[PDB]
Design a protein around this ligand. Structure first.
Ligand code: NI
Ligand code: NI
Lengths: 333, 237, 572, 107
DNA sequence: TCCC
DNA sequence: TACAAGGGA
């Protein structure tokens, strides 16, 4: 077994690199592989050698660059180019780094340098760092080129993200799904199915993409990959990026879970879909306060939240069919 | 002793499928062969006939699940039973046993999976009111209890009559078929293959159009479907 | 046999290129100028494939890019299959019966069958719909793209500029790329294409072009083109001098509004010949009450043929005289004027009628398509045309790939195992909308009376409608701009009206007022200073020729439209 | 169990087809602490039966069905033992949420 | 300093 | 939601 070690830098960046490990592996093969979490290390056990790993990684980044060139110093509206790169200079910086990694890679040559990691792949990083009584010029934090590129691939292939414009500013909600016990190939590909490309939602009627929890509820409404985590424990790590007057910063880092929300949604949708998906969509669009009450009730299991959400929905435009009421009552138990 | 269709028994239907496939063989086999070189493993047209015959015999074995067939006999609703999942379990395991290869049984399991109609997962816009949804598929999967006790016996019988090499039967409990179908469906949904899978497995789907011939139908366009039922006559007259 | 040539065309120049297809091959490229008239590209290999059974390929597919005479291709294929039916039997009566049935237009309706027919003609607009659709009848799902994989799909000039909605070379490159790994033969027909595309869609395929050896290709002859002022009165002197001689005039409009008025203003001021058996017979453009063949098989006459951007491809007119057309993006113009088929010569004439630039607002989008359109004086009736389009569309547009509503991403992740197009995620595929032509004056009494859902009550199957004749009754409407609805909206199986809040594309629609038999309707210093201009749009709906700073297009029709709010400062 | 019928009767007071909009009763019965106020609220909710039946008869749609006396005593015989307000809360909110269902009455 |  | 306050090449 390769049991390839993963560098310890940041349990968010470490997650990204050790979790793009698998997407680099699958394109080259590497069957019967597992990912053991160590809190932050996220070690991986595989029966693969290095060459197939490199072929898989270069195939993944070749597809990445093929997608990048489809739109256009070339700036494309991609997840790794402009969808998640909050900084304008990174829009060009990241593709150049990716193509340099390629050019070094097809000729069987290891990397020889290091690059600065944006705040997108790790919110724990930044520009400065308090040493004793002040900060450093430039960016003290830097990572290896191969780890940077492979973490970018892992972020682009698995982790969902939602952008909303609202004029000059822009909210970008970035989520990462993390195991804590054990995963195999099939689970990881099920997680991969969650990722959806070009989530440039913009628009004005869909204004509830602010309040990140509501945005992820909307995204999970239309995601039907698998109900995998009803038997396996998983967590979600979320953060937000803002463009308030060209002032980019991170203003939200709450860490709750993802299992029970979609579990309640999945137990909520047995009866039918024709009155379920439109139900949630109407409550989200019309009764934003009602949707907030509903999501709070899901998060903290309080009876009055469901009643308040239903009342707010019915007041404006929601039909509130009978079967959804029966499903809610069955959820109450 | 079991009955596949409501109007037709297992034999009087499966024999019709197999017989029609004998005529449609020289028409659709070379397309299957040219598709299956792309996979990476290839055999002759006779082994392709064997593979197609196994699919013909094994796509209705899941029909005889002793609860779904009871609903078929009466007018009781079935509410989304996908017996093709158990049939794909059978096909995968039995083809493991006979053909001694790993990818072709996976392809055959998918081919069984689409039989009648494939499953639909993800990327929806609330136009799946019917059973085309993984939640009801998993509902039927856990409510699955077991196949007829004589299923192994008559599976051995049709194995003997169609090939006669060795009789062997897989036994699904409930969780094992769960693992098999989830693994195969998830892997088919995501691999380095992007358009290869759809072309290949739809190509194997195409010859499976004899169901209209097996049971009486009143479709207006079925006559148009009969236009391609037989190939151009080799003899001038 | 393969040597035996059933048609009376003997052997063509690409006879030796037939063997490059075989049964196990990749991408093979065929190039010949003015291929619309004498195509004969890929039908002989399939026909020789089926002579004594032993089919190499299941079916054949002919692709028309955006909108053309599909009925003409259907009739041509029917004639060819009837001809191959000869010397084998079938007498005389029942041969045509099966010939008419094996040809399927497959407009998109008749969900009972997805794609069936020994030889069929398709459109890229319908081809995209065919890669992902659901056709389930009797609990049996016919997968529309399943027949596409093993059938011979052949394109025909699919690099033609349209109403800012089809001219995407990147999409074509993606399609050929994804079709490459299917291990199926893909051959494309094109008259003029840039050298830059020929390498990113065929990285290891050599171009056969035109060979000096074995001079047997159908030559065009002598064609002269000149720039003339665009006026209705100016062209008149060129009409009365060809109708009496025996020739005909072919007028092409880049806008449906111009085409729906040119014939009317030209059919009244002549009053010289018959109208019922000769006139009122033009190409179809979302009119003619659904069907197209009613005024399509009668076009074989040396009379006035009013036309538009639909007659561009798929025409085998033997008597070609004068062709007048609006502004075209070079590639369109050369294909349009190359209508002089058969024997070379025939005094083929082609001219352009534009007042100044007014026709560029519907088929050029300003940009290099209209700026360099006026710089087209050469006949370009040879194989050196590839040295002309490079400075007309490649140097200014293709390098910047400036396009709007391009949905490439909806073809990679969505098309992995199976999905469907009528229910997309965020990017609907703008292909077509099927309306219904009615004219009920006293009938409207809510719910439109007939055309009900026909649920479990009445019908046990609950899936039945009286739209059997509707297969030849819907129009070809493309979602460009609606602003406000004008026709009776629909949701499912007609009726129920409603949907006043931005109705979506596809299905639905019921046109009441717009239903009639006749028609259906509602760089000076910049070039010499710098280059490498910008693309896309801005507050002004035109392109920008950014030489050093700013320098937008205060010209074309965008300036006239924007002058309604700012008509001062010399219109900017 | 005897919840669907009272749910329909309560929804009869919220549907748009009944242009009366009695939200005070449902809001009061939803927010109940102990026996007395919930009993008073359900009494006030069921007191509006004659106006509902008259409006339904005048509109033409079938009249609403008042909960049967057979399960009327069920509410009492289950509710006295609910000394703890906590387990009372689940039913107090279940009736309220059943009061907000569609319950197509007049087609 | 450039770069939103 | 109005204002400010920022991350980088
Ligand atoms: Ni079956
Ligand atoms: Ni069938």
């Amino acid at each position: 077994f390769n049991e390839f070690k993963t560098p310890q830098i940041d349990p968010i960046f470490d997650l990204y690199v050790a979790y793009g490990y698998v997407v680099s592996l699958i394109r080259g093969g590497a069957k019967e592989a597992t990912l053991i979490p160590h809190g932050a290390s996220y070690l991986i056990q595989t029966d693969v050698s290095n060459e197939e790993f490199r072929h898989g990684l270069v195939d993944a980044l070749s597809s990445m660059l093929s997608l990048h060139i489809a739109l256009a110093k070339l700036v494309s509206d991609a997840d790794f180019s402009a969808g998640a790169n909050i900084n304008n200079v990174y829009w060009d910086s990241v593709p150049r780094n990716l193509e340099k990694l390629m050019k070094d890679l097809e000729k069987k040559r290891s990397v020889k340098g290091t690059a600065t990691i944006p705040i997108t792949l790790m919110p724990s990083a930044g520009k400065y760092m308090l040493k004793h009584f002040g900060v450093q010029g430039g960016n003290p934090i830097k990572v290896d080129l191969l780890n940077y590129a492979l973490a970018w691939v892992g972020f682009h292939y698995y982790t969902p993200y939602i952008k909303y414009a609202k004029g000059d500013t822009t909210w970008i909600h970035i989520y990462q799904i993390a195991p804590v016990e054990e995963v195999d190939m099939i689970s990881i590909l099920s997680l991969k199915d969650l990722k959806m490309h070009l989530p440039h939602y913009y628009e004005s009627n869909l204004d509830f993409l602010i309040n990140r929890r509501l945005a992820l509820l909307y995204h999970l409404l239309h995601s039907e990959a698998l109900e995998l985590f009803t038997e396996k424990e998983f967590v979600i790590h979320s953060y937000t990026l803002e463009r308030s007057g060209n002032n980019q910063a991170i203003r939200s880092f709450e860490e709750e879970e993802i299992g029970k929300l979609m579990d309640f949604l999945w137990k909520l949708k047995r009866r039918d879909f024709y009155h379920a998906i439109k139900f949630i969509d109407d409550l989200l669009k019309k009764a934003t306060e009602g949707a907030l009450a509903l999501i709070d009730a899901i998060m903290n299991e309080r009876l009055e939240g469901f009643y308040t959400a239903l009342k707010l929905g019915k007041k404006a435009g929601v039909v509130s069919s009978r079967e959804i009421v029966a499903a809610l009552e069955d959820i109450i138990c | 002793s079991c009955k596949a269709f409501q109007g037709q028994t297992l034999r009087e239907h499966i024999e019709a499928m197999l017989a029609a496939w004998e005529i449609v063989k020289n028409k659709y086999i070379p397309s299957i062969i040219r598709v299956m070189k792309t996979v990476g493993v290839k055999f002759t047209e006779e082994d392709a006939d064997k593979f197609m015959k196994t699919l013909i015999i094994l796509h209705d074995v899941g029909k005889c699940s002793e609860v779904y067939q009871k609903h078929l006999s009466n007018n009781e609703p079935l509410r989304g039973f996908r017996h093709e999942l158990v049939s794909a379990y059978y096909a995968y395991n039995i083809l493991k046993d006979m053909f001694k290869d790993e990818t072709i049984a996976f392809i055959g399991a998918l081919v069984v999976m689409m039989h009648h109609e494939p499953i639909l997962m993800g990327q929806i816009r609330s136009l799946d009111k019917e059973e085309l949804t993984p939640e009801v598929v998993l509902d039927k999967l856990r409510t699955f209890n077991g196949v007829m006790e004589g299923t192994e016996s008559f599976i051995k019988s049709m194995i003997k009559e169609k090939l006669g090499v060795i009789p062997k039967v897989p036994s699904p409990t409930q969780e094992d078929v769960l693992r098999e179908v989830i693994r195969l469906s998830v892997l088919a949904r995501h691999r380095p293959d992007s358009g290869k899978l759809r072309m290949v497995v739809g190509a194997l789907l195409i010859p499976l159009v004899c169901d209209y011939k097996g049971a009486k139908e009143r479709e207006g366009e079925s006559p148009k479907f009969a236009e391609v039922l037989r190939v151009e006559m080799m003899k001038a007259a | 046999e393969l040597t035996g040539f059933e048609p009376y065309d003997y052997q063509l120049r690409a006879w030796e290129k037939i063997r490059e297809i075989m049964n196990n091959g990749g991408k093979v490229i065929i190039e010949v100028p003015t291929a619309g008239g004498k195509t004969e590209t890929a039908v002989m290999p399939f026909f020789a494939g089926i002579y004594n059974n032993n089919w190499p390929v299941a079916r054949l597919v002919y692709v028309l890019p955006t909108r053309s005479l599909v009925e003409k291709q259907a009739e041509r294929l029917r004639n060819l299959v009837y001809k191959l039916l000869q010397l084998k039997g079938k007498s005389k009566e029942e041969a045509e019966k099966l010939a008419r049935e094996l040809v399927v237009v497959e407009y998109g309706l008749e969900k009972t069958h997805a794609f069936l027919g020994w030889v069929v003609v398709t459109t890229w607009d319908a081809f995209l719909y065919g890669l992902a659709a659901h056709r389930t009848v009797g609990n049996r799902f016919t997968f529309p793209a399943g027949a596409i994989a093993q059938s011979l799909v052949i394109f025909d000039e699919v690099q033609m500029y349209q109403d800012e909605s089809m001219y995407m070379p990147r999409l074509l490159s993606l399609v050929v790329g994804i079709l490459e790994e299917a291990n199926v033969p893909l051959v494309i027909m094109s008259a003029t294409i840039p050298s830059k595309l020929r390498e990113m869609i065929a990285g290891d395929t050599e171009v056969i072009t035109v060979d000096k050896n074995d001079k047997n290709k159908p030559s065009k002859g002598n064609v002269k083109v000149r720039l003339v002022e665009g006026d209705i009165t100016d062209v008149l002197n060129d009409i009365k001098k060809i109708l009496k001689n025996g020739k005909k005039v072919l007028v092409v409009r880049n806008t449906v509004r111009k085409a729906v008025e040119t014939y009317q203003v030209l059919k009244k001021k002549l009053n010289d010949t018959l109208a019922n058996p000769s006139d009122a017979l033009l190409i179809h453009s979302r009119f003619t009450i659904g069907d197209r063949r009613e005024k399509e098989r009668a076009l074989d006459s040396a009379r006035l043929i009013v036309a538009t951007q639909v007659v561009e491809a798929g025409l085998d007119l033997p008597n070609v005289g004068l062709v007048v057309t609006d502004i075209a993006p070079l590639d369109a113009l050369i294909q349009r004027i190359g209508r002089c088929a058969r024997r070379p010569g025939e005094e083929g004439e082609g001219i352009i009628l534009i007042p100044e630039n007014c026709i560029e607002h519907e088929k050029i989008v300003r940009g290099l398509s209209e700026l360099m359109e006026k710089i087209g004086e050469d006949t370009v009736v040879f194989a050196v045309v590839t040295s002309t389009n490079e400075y007309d569309r490649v140097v200014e547009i293709h390098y910047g790939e400036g396009k709007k509503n391009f949905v490439y991403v909806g073809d990679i992740d969505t098309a992995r195992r199976v999905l469907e197009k009528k229910r997309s995620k965020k990017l609907p595929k703008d292909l077509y909308i099927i309306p219904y032509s009615v004219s009920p004056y006293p009938d409207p009494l809510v719910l439109l009376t007939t055309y009900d859902e026909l649920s479990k009550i009445g019908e046990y199957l609950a899936d039945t409608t009286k739209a059997r004749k509707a297969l030849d009754r819907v129009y070809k409407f493309h979602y460009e701009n609606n602003i406000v609805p004008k026709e009776f909206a629909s949701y499912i199986y007609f009726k129920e009206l409603k949907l006043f809040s931005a109705p979506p594309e596809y299905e639905k629609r019921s046109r009441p007022e717009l239903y009639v038999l006749l028609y259906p309707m509602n760089a000076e210093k910049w070039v010499w200073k710098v280059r490498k201009s910008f693309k896309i749009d801005p507050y002004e709906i035109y392109v920008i020729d950014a030489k050093y700073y700013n320098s937008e297009l205060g010209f074309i029709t965008n300036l006239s439209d924007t002058n309604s709010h700012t008509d001062s400062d010399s219109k900017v | 169990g005897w919840i669907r019928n009272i749910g329909r009767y309560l929804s009869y007071l919220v549907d748009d087809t009944f242009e009366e909009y009695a939200y005070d009763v449902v809001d009061g019965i939803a927010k109940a602490r102990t026996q007395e106020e919930l009993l008073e609220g359900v009494y006030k909710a069921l007191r509006l039966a004659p106006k509902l039946k008259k409006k339904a008869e005048s509109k033409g749609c079938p009249p609403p069905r008042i909960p049967s006396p057979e399960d009327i005593e069920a509410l009492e015989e289950k509710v006295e033992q609910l000394s703890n307000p906590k387990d009372l809360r689940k039913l107090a909110v279940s009736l309220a949420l059943w009061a907000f269902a569609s319950w197509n009455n007049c087609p």
